[PDB]
Design a protein around this ligand. Sequence first.
Ligand SMILES: Nc1ncnc2c1ncn2[C@@H]1O[C@H](COP(=O)(O)OP(=O)(O)OP(=O)(O)O)[C@@H](O)[C@H]1O
Ligand SMILES: Nc1ncnc2c1ncn2[C@@H]1O[C@H](COP(=O)(O)OP(=O)(O)OP(=O)(O)O)[C@@H](O)[C@H]1O
Ligand SMILES: [Mg+2]
Ligand SMILES: [Zn+2]
Ligand SMILES: [Zn+2]
Lengths: 612, 604
Amino acid sequence: MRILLCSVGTSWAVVPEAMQLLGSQGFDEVHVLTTASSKISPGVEQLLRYFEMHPGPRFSISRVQDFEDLRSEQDHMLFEEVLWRWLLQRAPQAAHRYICLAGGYKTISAAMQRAAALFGACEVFHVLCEPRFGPQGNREASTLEEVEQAIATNALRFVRLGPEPGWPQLRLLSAPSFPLESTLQGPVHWVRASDMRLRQHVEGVLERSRHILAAWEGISELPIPALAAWPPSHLRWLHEPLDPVQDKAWVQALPKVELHCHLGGFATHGELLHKVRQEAANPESLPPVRAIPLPPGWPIPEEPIGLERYMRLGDNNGSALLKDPGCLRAQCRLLYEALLADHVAYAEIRCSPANYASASRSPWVVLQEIRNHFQQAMEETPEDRRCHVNLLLTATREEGGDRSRIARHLALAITAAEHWKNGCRVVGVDLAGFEDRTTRAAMFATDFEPVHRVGLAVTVHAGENDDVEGIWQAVFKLSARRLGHALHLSRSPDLLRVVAERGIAVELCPYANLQIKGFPLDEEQEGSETYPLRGYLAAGVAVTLNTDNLGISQASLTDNLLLTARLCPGITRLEVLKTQVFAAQAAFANQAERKALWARLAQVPVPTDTEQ
Amino acid sequence: MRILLCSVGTSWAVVPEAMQLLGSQGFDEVHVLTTASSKISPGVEQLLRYFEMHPGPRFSISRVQDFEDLRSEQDHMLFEEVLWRWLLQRAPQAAHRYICLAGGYKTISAAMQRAAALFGACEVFHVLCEPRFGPQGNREASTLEEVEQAIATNALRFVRLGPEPGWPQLRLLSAPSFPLESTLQGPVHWVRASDMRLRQHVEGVLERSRHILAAWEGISELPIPALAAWPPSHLRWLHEPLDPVQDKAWVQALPKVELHCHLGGFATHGELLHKVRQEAANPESLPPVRAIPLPPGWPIPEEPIGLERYMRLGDNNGSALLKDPGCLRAQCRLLYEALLADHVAYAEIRCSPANYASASRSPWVVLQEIRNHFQQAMEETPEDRRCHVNLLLTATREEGGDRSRIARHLALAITAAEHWKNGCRVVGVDLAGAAMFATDFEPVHRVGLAVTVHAGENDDVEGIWQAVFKLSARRLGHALHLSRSPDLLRVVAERGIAVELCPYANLQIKGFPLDEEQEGSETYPLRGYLAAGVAVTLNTDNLGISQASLTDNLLLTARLCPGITRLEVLKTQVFAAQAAFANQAERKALWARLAQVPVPTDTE
Ligand SMILES: Nc1ncnc2c1ncn2[C@@H]1O[C@H](COP(=O)(O)OP(=O)(O)OP(=O)(O)O)[C@@H](O)[C@H]1O
Ligand SMILES: Nc1ncnc2c1ncn2[C@@H]1O[C@H](COP(=O)(O)OP(=O)(O)OP(=O)(O)O)[C@@H](O)[C@H]1O
Ligand SMILES: [Mg+2]
Ligand SMILES: [Zn+2]
Ligand SMILES: [Zn+2]
């Protein structure tokens, strides 16, 4: 089976001439598309007559209604937009198509040759008749007799350039997808192009291909393989330094991952603290709102305020408050809205249910409510806009240490891990207060064999400190898989290798680290006191950027990603985009949750200021 | 610059008119391509006349010295070759390239257009002149005076089609790569094409670029990202089950990673055993060659012979022979050339230097020599086929309670960890075996050494638990009973711990059904581990006792695990590449070797 397709200009003999390209085998179905010019209609009748005679195969004559003649580029494109549509309907496949570019404009033959290499074809050929006919014998065949003279006298030359396989994304463009309006004005199919959709599709299938092939070299330096379809000018933008003020609208739209977030430090002051209190189940046991003054310049202080002072800023929330069932519900719902305004796709919230247990509300009752308040908010959100929330139970700070309180949280986490197997889950424990030397014994004095034997992951909170010996015991004694605020790894080069090669992730909180211990800002060169984010990446450490306390720090996740530009000199926009892939791998998520998080991470927003 | 390329034929006024595309500014140097036909010569003389009477931009006239009239596609093939090469010489840049497809045959314009669509161009226009000239005012301006009036009277209408982006890997082709010979028969540069490289290097690019696009979406499933450039038939042959008869040549040519290989069990008998004894420094001390019979069916025994009988099968080599300084070189060199013949790109050899120490050669002297016998062999191999060898020290539990050997090996590994920073390195210790939990393996962890633990012959699930969390093992050897504990099989996958599996050593020790029509209750746990997300690696263990190379071990999986595909054998190599104890420099060099996957030969 073989379709024939050719363009007809002012000479119609080409169509009967191409009929002999296969000797006497001909074509199983021929088609002719030409213009609406008044000089073409006269040739239509001749082909109709010649189609009336020798009517072996099926015939069809079509003319572009909206293309009289070539006056401007708008005309060629108009006919170009129709050729592909007509080329799909008449020719459904690419292995049966045969094309001739004899009749038509020099820009119409170019529209025929190009059109074949895009949707695939079996062959493209040309015809050239000897000018040994007509009066004086110095002209080519122009009558039904002269044409048959050259047909029977071997006066036609066929220049067959060769077949075209076609591109992969265009061999499935079916004509029904791009309908062509055909009018039956007798034996002529006058066609009209409804929309320019097909052209807007091919230009989108060949534009994306050229971008992928230009990025098939650094495809291993790209954290997200979906960045390949990005224009080369955009990929050069991605490789330049981050701008904290120009990229705010790009970082704010990134699908991010949260791994370090305390539930009790969320709404500590401002319009949010007063909103949590208004939800109290009994607005009579709420303690008086203290007056905790934020240090000057908050969120960016003038000097570090130490860890002890940093905790005290969250005294209007936490253990006091949220013991009320109504105020706890508000926190678990006002916090999920924050994770939706940051475009966070996966979050692990750190909670201490034993801090919220009253005489009638056991730690399990509190933990069961926290899980169900996030699971309801998760279910009331579209699957494409839904932030997945998992829970970590915290072995708290110096408030802990007692044997009768660090093993109650471990038992609570073990029971919860086996309880919920879908939706919001308890995925691990957070050994906070690990930097407390007194509580250090309590952490190593308690057995963690049950925690590891049930599949719960351990993350260690290496807060403000300089004891590199604690990090060694966290990796090898507690089998921790993540490290919190490990800001002095570069000092011990031998420990930086162990962390990098073993795959332990490091949780860095830009704002919390700046407000507690302080770091140089905007320095033109990397010195000795500089933030270690860029040194960890060079050493092969899987670093992640988190918020820690959305309320105490007064900075969102976007404000933490932007501060790295002013905190690490030279950090690029592919570096921040790379920490989101490290976080996705450091998350204590199962296969189902990971597969849903990579889909969200593979939707990096396109930049807008890629013009210089 | 605004270089312009013009094609000419029986009409020559196109070039003088095409030069007006830019208006009064014009071009800086317009170039013309022409054939060898005599009929075009009158235009050529007129074209030179126009150029000489219109001085300015560099004017060049080139004729196709091997094409005179369109007769067959052979002429067409020769036209494009020169055309592309001609366009690669007269117009180097893609922003200075202005092309006019008017002049020439009907197939010439397509080549002038298609070629632009492949190499790009600033513009490929089309100048049309009003037929208001000639003696009767009916023909297009043909003479010198008519062309001027056509330009002067604005009888020109240029049909601009647009610029051309081209293709990324094709928008770099320079002139010297595909040169040309221009015979100066006067002001005309008669050009000709020597070879056809500019049509085989181009036609093949679009072949590879369509494979990438087709297989790009189906990516992230290929362990090696470079496989996307494979033909779809090849990329679909990769997803079919392995066939350990027809694939003995593709598996043999694969770059492989060796993570479990014992030095002392290499040349245990046969021709290799005598080539190690033959090089002994003190032939008067070589022990007599004990008679050790191999169970019938070796390497495939009719029944599992257990571990105790397996060890005794290699009693003609090892500490018996390796205490000789000369026999320790043949072992280290006859072993490195066995990995070269197997295409191994990175290997970790397990040795016990304390078993070869005499009263004059301390364990450090033996290790000092083993390291330099591998480093010397590595440096004497080209850096293209060079297998990088690292060393693990095996601290085997002894059946005397004698833990002095354990102490010497652990101290030796810590000492050698800092000594060597390049070339062959001691990268970890092998805990081939409660005492180790009282051994205080912390010091090896503090110096950066990795730990590998052989899983005992018993189904000691509590043993694999303590290796992961007490010994902090990063790899597990012979952990065939992981599926027993569903919670353990999930901890191993989530922590990224790798499992070292030896298809022959496991078959000849425990025994597994072979070529069973479907998965059963006593099948090799390869596919079960892979499905559970466990990082699995296939090794040789003892290349001498087992009598099988790394290639044979990979093929035996086609029988132990029915339905295993050829993409899985590549996954095990990527898992090994990430489970290796190599550093960044070594890992970077190993990824380059892995990326050179051999291409399937049948595919049909
Ligand atoms: N620095 C921190 N370390 C650990 N958990 C913290 C920290 N700050 C806040 N939290 C979170 O707060 C919750 C319990 O602590 P909470 O905020 O109630 O503090 P507290 O010590 O009980 O008293 P206060 O009311 O003065 O804050 C848990 O979610 C815990 O994760
Ligand atoms: N498949 C196996 N399973 C367990 N242990 C093994 C296996 N293969 C070898 N071993 C033991 O592991 C250690 C590896 O050391 P190696 O084989 O290089 O030494 P050797 O020179 O053969 O020692 P020997 O003096 O015992 O003969 C030895 O104890 C060897 O017996
Ligand atoms: Mg031995
Ligand atoms: Zn914290
Ligand atoms: Zn072993």
